[PDB]
Write a protein that binds this ligand. Structure first.
Ligand SMILES: OC[C@H]1O[C@@H](O[C@@H]2[C@H](O)[C@@H](O)[C@H](O[C@H]3[C@H](O)[C@@H](O)[C@@H](O)O[C@@H]3CO)O[C@@H]2CO)[C@H](O)[C@@H](O)[C@H]1O
Ligand SMILES: OC[C@H]1O[C@@H](O[C@@H]2[C@H](O)[C@@H](O)[C@H](O[C@H]3[C@H](O)[C@@H](O)[C@@H](O)O[C@@H]3CO)O[C@@H]2CO)[C@H](O)[C@@H](O)[C@H]1O
Ligand SMILES: *[C@@H]1O[C@H](CO)[C@@H](O[C@@H]2O[C@H](CO)[C@@H](O)[C@H](O)[C@H]2NC(C)=O)[C@H](O)[C@H]1NC(C)=O
Ligand SMILES: *[C@@H]1O[C@H](CO)[C@@H](O[C@@H]2O[C@H](CO)[C@@H](O)[C@H](O)[C@H]2NC(C)=O)[C@H](O)[C@H]1NC(C)=O
Ligand SMILES: *[C@@H]1O[C@H](CO)[C@@H](O)[C@H](O)[C@H]1NC(C)=O
Ligand SMILES: *[C@@H]1O[C@H](CO)[C@@H](O)[C@H](O)[C@H]1NC(C)=O
Ligand SMILES: *[C@@H]1O[C@H](CO)[C@@H](O)[C@H](O)[C@H]1NC(C)=O
Ligand SMILES: *[C@@H]1O[C@H](CO)[C@@H](O)[C@H](O)[C@H]1NC(C)=O
Ligand SMILES: *[C@H]1O[C@H](CO)[C@@H](O)[C@H](O)[C@@H]1O
Ligand SMILES: *[C@H]1O[C@H](CO)[C@@H](O)[C@H](O)[C@@H]1O
Lengths: 542, 542
C-alpha cells in the first residue's frame, strides 16, 4: 500500500480502529433460499383507495428502492478504500455528532449485496439506486486509482441485473474524500481543484459503467450536502477567507460547476459512442411550501424564499433560466460566486432528468419579526429563508394542527404529506422542466420509536410506514393519469435499516429490518415491503 | 363507630401525603367557550372504507366514551372519600408497582367534568360510561355513608344529561375500600361479609340514581380484577388458607355472588317502582382466540381453555347454563368454591345485557410441552390455560407474522385485531345470549411512544389510534348489518389520557391529550377524537 493512504487511516483510527464485520466474504445465495412467510392476507386490507383501481404506471416505470454507498456498505477499509470525512467525523466525535455509531459495518451490504438483491427480487422491485464510494475509486480522492474499488461495483452491477434490478447510479452521496478536505478544503476550495478532481473521478466511473448504467445523477441532495459544510469536520479546515456561513454557498457554486463539467463529459462520452446513451441530472429535495395563512403576502414570500434556497439555488441554474433565483443573490451577495460565462455553458441545460426526494411538503410562516428585518441579519435564527424554521411552525397550521402525520421525532423534518405530492410535481415540472421527465427519487418513513421494539413481530407490522408508501405511490399514480406528469419512477428510501448519518443505526427507514444484534445482520421483511411489492403487482405492466 | 377515616388515610400517607391539584373547585363553562380549531379537512380519509357505506347503527345506539373513577377523577381525599387499595399501593410501592405515579390528582376530572362534557358534546358524543368510587359512598366500605359522595355524582349525572350524554354506570371498577381489605380481606373473604357489604353499597347507588341511570354494569372485567388479587396489596393480608392462586378463584366466586345478589336487589327496586326500569350486566373482556395452526386439535383445545378461563368462568354462570366451564371445573375446582343452587338462583340469568371490552383477539398456541402435562402442574408457567401465553406466541402465527399492528410495548397485550371482531361477536352472542343485546363496552389504543413526544402538533395527529378506532367501529357497523348482531353501543377507552393502573399517566389512551405538565391539565383534541366524531355523523341516527 501507499503510505499516504496508511497515514490517513492511522489518523482516522487514532481514537478507535475500524471494526470488521462478522463475515467478510462475498456471500453466495443458495438456489433454495427460503424467504420468511407472507403476512396475513388481511394485513394489506384497505390501504389502497378505490380511486386508483386499474390504473397502471407507464410502461418502463422504474419501481425501485434507494441506498447510498456509505450508508449501506460497511467494509470501510476493505480492498483499498480510503477514508471519508464521515469515517473521520464518527471515529473522533462519535459521542456528540454520530449518536455513538459509525459507518464501519452498517448493514454490510458490501459483502451481502447478492442476498439483498435476491430478497429484493422476491418483492418485484425492478430498479436499484446506489451511490459510488468515491474513496473506493480514488482512495486519496485524486491520484492513483484503486482497481479493486472499480471491480467491486462491476460485480455489484452484474448481480443486480441478474436479479431483475436495473441499476441507477449516483456519483457522489456525501462521502467526501478526507484527503481532499485536508489538502485544500474540498468543496470549500476557493480555487477550482475540487472540480478538476471530481470530474476525473466522474469520467472514470462513467467510462467504466456507462455501458451498463443508463440513468445517472451527479450529486445526491446538494442543498442538504452543502448545508452540512457549515459543520464539523469541514469547519476544522476552511480555506482563508471562508466563514462557516459561506462554506454553504461556496460549496453551492463549486457543486454547480462540478455537475456542469461532468454532464459535458457524460454527453461527450455518449456522443462519441463510448458508452450507451442515457440521462443525467441530480436529485433535488425539500419543496415549495404552502403559506400558513393562504393569500397572505408574507407567508407567500417566505414560501418563495424557501423554494429558492432549498430547490431553486441548484435547480434554476440547471433546469431553468441558468442563474440563481433572484431572492438568493440579493440576500447573500458576494458569499455566492457569480456565474462566469463559461460556467453557464456547462450548467444551464446540464440536466436530462429532474429528480425530487419528495419526502414531504412543509408550511411556511413568515418570520414574526418581519422578513425584511430578518433577511438583513445573518445572525437571525431564521436567516436566510426568513420563515419560522422551527418545528412548531414548519409543520403546523394557525389552527394548531399539523399538515399531516409526524414520524419519529428524531427525524422531525419528516411528515406524511401525500395530498400535496401532485401539486409539487406540477410546480417542479413546469418550473424546472427536463426533457427526460421527473423521478420520485426518495421517499420513506421512520416509524416512531421502532428502534425500541425488542420483539420481531412488533417490528414487522409497521402500519405508519406501510401507509405512507401507499399514500405516496397513490398520489404518484394520479399525477400520471390525472395531471399528465412525465413521471419516470418511484424509489423508496430505503430497502434496509441502515446508517442514517448523524442518527446512526438508531433511526430505521427500511422496509426490511436489519438485526443489528446478529453477527450475520440477518434480514427479515416488514409489512411495508409487502405493501410495496403488492402495489407493484397491482399497478405495473407485465 | 366514627370517621376513623383518618387512621386509614394516615396509613396511606405514611410515606408521602396525598397531593392536592391546582384546581379544587367546580369549574364553570362559559357559554362562549371556544374550542381549538378543527384539523385539516383533508384528514380522516382512507379510514372509512367503501364497504361500510350507507350503513347506520340502530336508533338509540350508545355512541360514547368510557372512564373509571380512580383513573380520571383524582380528588383522592376530597369531600370525605375513603382510601382504596390503590391509594395504599401507590403511596407505598410507587417505585415498583405504580411507575412512580399515584391517582391522587390524575386528570382532575372530579372538578373539571362540566368542561369535559361540553367538549364531548362538541364532538357529538351521546353516552358517558363511568364508575363510582365505592369509597366515596362508604369511605370505610361499610358503615357510615358519605352524603357528599352521593351528592357529587348527582351533579355529574345532571351535567352529563345536560350535555346530551346518556349516563351509563359501573358500580365497581377495582377501587376496593382499603378498610375492608384490612378488616376481613377483600374478595378473599372466606365468609360472606364482602357480599353483604357490596350489596349494601350497590343498593345505595341504585336508589339514588336509578331514575337517571338506566344501563348498569356491576363489575368491570372481573377476570382481570380477580387476577389482580393475586398481587399486592391483596397478598399482604390473605386470610389463609388462601395462597396467591387460591386468591384469584375465591375472588371469582365472591364476585359472582356479589354480582348475583346485587342484580336481584336491582330487580326488586325496579319491580317495586323505586327506580326507573333499566338493564344490568357486567363487562367481560379478552377473547376466544384463533388457533395458531387451523384444524390442529391441540391449538383448538388451548383456545377453548383460554376462553373458559378468561370469559366462560364468569359468563357461563351468568348468561349460560349457570355453572363453570367444564374445563375450568376439571382444572381448578379444588380452589374454586362450588356455586350452590341458591347461588345459581341469583347468578343464572343475572345479565339483561352483555358487554365485551373487545380490545383484541389473541392467537392460541398449545403448550409446547403438551397441554396434558401443563394442566397437571400448577407450577408450569402456562398453567391453567396451557397455551403458550408469552408475547412471541400469543400474537404470532407459525409464519412468524403478527395477527395485527402492535401498540405501545408497555401495553403489549394490545393489538389491532379488527378483522376478528365480527367472529368474536357471533361467538359471544350465541354462547352467552342476553335479552338486551351486547355492548362493545371498551376498546382503544395506546399509541406507541406518544408519551415521549414533546410538541403538541406531534401528539395530536395520532394516525394509528385514529385507524384503530375507525377499523373497529367499521366492523361493529358491519356486525349489525351482515351478521344481525344485536349490538347496543360502542364506547371508546378513553376520552382523556388517564391513569393507567401500574403504568400511571405514562400510557396514553385518550382521544384527547391531557397536558399533565400544566396546572390546569388543559385538554386538546387528537385526530382520533374527530375521527370518532366524524364516524358518528356518518353512521349515527341522532
Ligand atoms: O434519513 C435522513 C434523511 O435526512 C434528510 O435531510 C433532512 C432534510 O431533508 C434537510 O433539509 C435537512 O437539512 C438540515 C441539515 O441536515 C442539518 O445538518 C442542519 O445544518 O440543518 C439543515 C436545515 O437547516 O436535514 C434533514 C435531516 O437532518 C434527507 O432529506 C433525506 O434524504 C434523508 O437522508
Ligand atoms: O391498562 C391497559 C388495559 O389493561 C387491560 O388489562 C390487560 C389485559 O386485558 C389483562 O388480561 C391482563 O391481566 C394480567 C394481569 O394484569 C396481571 O396481574 C397478571 O395476572 O397477568 C394477567 C394476564 O394473564 O392485564 C393487562 C394489563 O396489565 C385492561 O383490561 C384494560 O381495561 C386496560 O386498562
Ligand atoms: C463546526 O461544526 C460544528 C458541529 O457540526 C458546529 O457545532 C454546532 O455548534 C452550535 C453552536 O454552539 C451548536 O448550537 C450546535 O448544536 C452544534 N451542532 C451539532 C449538533 O453538531 C459548530 O458551530 C461549527 N463551528 C463553527 C466554526 O462555528
Ligand atoms: C436478533 O438476533 C438475536 C441473536 O441471534 C436474537 O436473539 C436470539 O433469538 C433466538 C431465536 O431463535 C434465540 O434462540 C436466542 O436464544 C436469542 N439469543 C439470545 C440473545 O439469547 C434476536 O431474537 C433477534 N431479534 C430479532 C428481532 O429477530
Ligand atoms: C405477592 O405479590 C407480588 C406482586 O404484587 C408478587 O411479586 C408476589 O409474587 C406475590 N406472590 C407471593 C408469592 O407473595
Ligand atoms: C396453593 O394451594 C393450593 C391448594 O389451595 C396448592 O395445591 C398449591 O400448591 C399452593 N401453592 C402455593 C404455595 O403457592
Ligand atoms: C412442573 O414444571 C416445572 C417447571 O415449571 C418443572 O421444572 C417441574 O419439573 C414440573 N414438574 C413435573 C413433574 O411436571
Ligand atoms: C403543556 O403546557 C406547557 C405549559 O403551558 C407547555 O410548555 C407545553 O408545550 C404543553 N405541552 C404540549 C406538548 O402541548
Ligand atoms: C474477511 O476478512 C476477515 C478478517 O477478519 C478474514 O478473517 C476472512 O477470512 C475474510 O478474508
Ligand atoms: C374553581 O373555582 C375557582 C374560584 O374559586 C376558579 O378560579 C377555578 O377556575 C375553578 O372554577
Amino acid at each position: 500500500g501507499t503510505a499516504e493512504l496508511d497515514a490517513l487511516w492511522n489518523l482516522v483510527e487514532a481514537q478507535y480502529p475500524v471494526q470488521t464485520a462478522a463475515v467478510t466474504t462475498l456471500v453466495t445465495v443458495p438456489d433454495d433460499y427460503k424467504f420468511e412467510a407472507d403476512p396475513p392476507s388481511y394485513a394489506l386490507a384497505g390501504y389502497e383507495t378505490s380511486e386508483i383501481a386499474g390504473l397502471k404506471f407507464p410502461k418502463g416505470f422504474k419501481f425501485g428502492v434507494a441506498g447510498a454507498a456509505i450508508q449501506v456498505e460497511g467494509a470501510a477499509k476493505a480492498e483499498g478504500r480510503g477514508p471519508s470525512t464521515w469515517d473521520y467525523l464518527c471515529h473522533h466525535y462519535a459521542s456528540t455528532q454520530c449518536n455513538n455509531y459509525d459507518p464501519d459495518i452498517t448493514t454490510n451490504h458490501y459483502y451481502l449485496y447478492p442476498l439483498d438483491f435476491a430478497r429484493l427480487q422476491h418483492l418485484g422491485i425492478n430498479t436499484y439506486s446506489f451511490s459510488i464510494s468515491w474513496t473506493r475509486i480514488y482512495p486519496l480522492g485524486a491520484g492513483y486509482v484503486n482497481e479493486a474499488g472499480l471491480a467491486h461495483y462491476d460485480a455489484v452491477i452484474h448481480s443486480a441485473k441478474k436479479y431483475g434490478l436495473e441499476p441507477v447510479g449516483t456519483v457522489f452521496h456525501w462521502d467526501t474524500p478526507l484527503s481532499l478536505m485536508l489538502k485544500y478544503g474540498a468543496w470549500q476550495d476557493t480555487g477550482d481543484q475540487i472540480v478538476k478532481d471530481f470530474v476525473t473521478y466522474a469520467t472514470t466511473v462513467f467510462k467504466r459503467y456507462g455501458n451498463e448504467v443508463k440513468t445517472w445523477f451527479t450529486f445526491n441532495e446538494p442543498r442538504v450536502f452543502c448545508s452540512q459544510n457549515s459543520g464539523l469536520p469541514y469547519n476544522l479546515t476552511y480555506p482563508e477567507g471562508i466563514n462557516s456561513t459561506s462554506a454553504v454557498f461556496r460549496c453551492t457554486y463549486n457543486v454547480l460547476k462540478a455537475h456542469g463539467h461532468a454532464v459535458k463529459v457524460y454527453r461527450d462520452l455518449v456522443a462519441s459512442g463510448t458508452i450507451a446513451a442515457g440521462e443525467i441530472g441530480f436529485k433535488s429535495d425539500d419543496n415549495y411550501p404552502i403559506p400558513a395563512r393562504p393569500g397572505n403576502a408574507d407567508d407567500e414570500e417566505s414560501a418563495k424564499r424557501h423554494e429558492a434556497f432549498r430547490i431553486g439555488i441548484f435547480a434554476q441554474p440547471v433546469y431553468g433560466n441558468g442563474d440563481y433565483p433572484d431572492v438568493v443573490k440579493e440576500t447573500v451577495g458576494d458569499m455566492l460566486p457569480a456565474l462566469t460565462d463559461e460556467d453557464k455553458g456547462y450548467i444551464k441545460g446540464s440536466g436530462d432528468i429532474f429528480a425530487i426526494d419528495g419526502y414531504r411538503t412543509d408550511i411556511s410562516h413568515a418570520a414574526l419579526n418581519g422578513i425584511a428585518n430578518c433577511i438583513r441579519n445573518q445572525s437571525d435564527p431564521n436567516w436566510p429563508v426568513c420563515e419560522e424554521g422551527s418545528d412548531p411552525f414548519a409543520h403546523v397550521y394557525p389552527s394548531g394542527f399539523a399538515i399531516g402525520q409526524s414520524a419519529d421525532p428524531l427525524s422531525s423534518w419528516l411528515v406524511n404529506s401525500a395530498p400535496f405530492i401532485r401539486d409539487q410535481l406540477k410546480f417542479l415540472t413546469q418550473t424546472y422542466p427536463a426533457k427526460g421527465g421527473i423521478y420520485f427519487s426518495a421517499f420513506g418513513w421512520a416509524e416512531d420509536a421502532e428502534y425500541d421494539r425488542q420483539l420481531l413481530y412488533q417490528i414487522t407490522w409497521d402500519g405508519l410506514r406501510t401507509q405512507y408508501l401507499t399514500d405516496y405511490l397513490s398520489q404518484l399514480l394520479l399525477a400520471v393519469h390525472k395531471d399528465g406528469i412525465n413521471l419516470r419512477g418511484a424509489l423508496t428510501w430505503s430497502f434496509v435499516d441502515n446508517w442514517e448519518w448523524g442518527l446512526g443505526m438508531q433511526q430505521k427507514f427500511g422496509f426490511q429490518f436489519v438485526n443489528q444484534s446478529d453477527p450475520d445482520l440477518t434480514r427479515t421483511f416488514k409489512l411495508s415491503a409487502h405493501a410495496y411489492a403488492q402495489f407493484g403487482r397491482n399497478h405495473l405492466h407485465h
